[PDB]
Design a protein around this nucleic acid. Structure first.
Length: 105
DNA sequence: GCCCCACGCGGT
DNA sequence: ACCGCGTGGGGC
């Protein structure tokens, strides 16, 4: 639960509605985005042998998304732009692979 | 370096 | 067909 001021401040910095959902994810799930990087054990559905993000916080994220971006009320926009960005955010690595290969030399 | 997003691909 | 992962081109 976060203020209207803070939601609009998040909208200011997000690039697309997918990134709005990703940012609301990071802000609402600060436990997973410490240097512990627990995010790498989670996704939005509980698929691919991974733990499932808090369904109710995810619902709140969708609430804010469909609120700011009304077009998000279609499941075909949430399921196709936000939850892919949410899962990518939870899973994306610290160091890129090719960057790790490049720092070898 | 951080961060975003498109995208081939393999399991379902 | 669909769905999520690993991955890298690339803007900042």
């Amino acid at each position: 639960l976060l203020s209207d001021k803070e939601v609009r401040e998040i909208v200011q910095q997000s690039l697309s509605v997918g990134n709005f959902a990703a940012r609301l994810l990071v802000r609402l799930f600060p436990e997973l985005f410490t240097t512990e990087n627990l995010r790498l054990q989670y996704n939005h559905s509980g698929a691919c042998n991974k733990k499932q993000l808090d369904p109710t916080r995810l619902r709140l994220i969708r609430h804010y998304v469909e609120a700011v971006y009304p077009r998000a009320k279609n499941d075909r926009v949430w399921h196709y732009e936000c939850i892919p960005s949410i899962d990518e955010r939870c899973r994306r690595p610290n160091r890129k692979k090719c960057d790790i290969l490049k720092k070898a030399k």
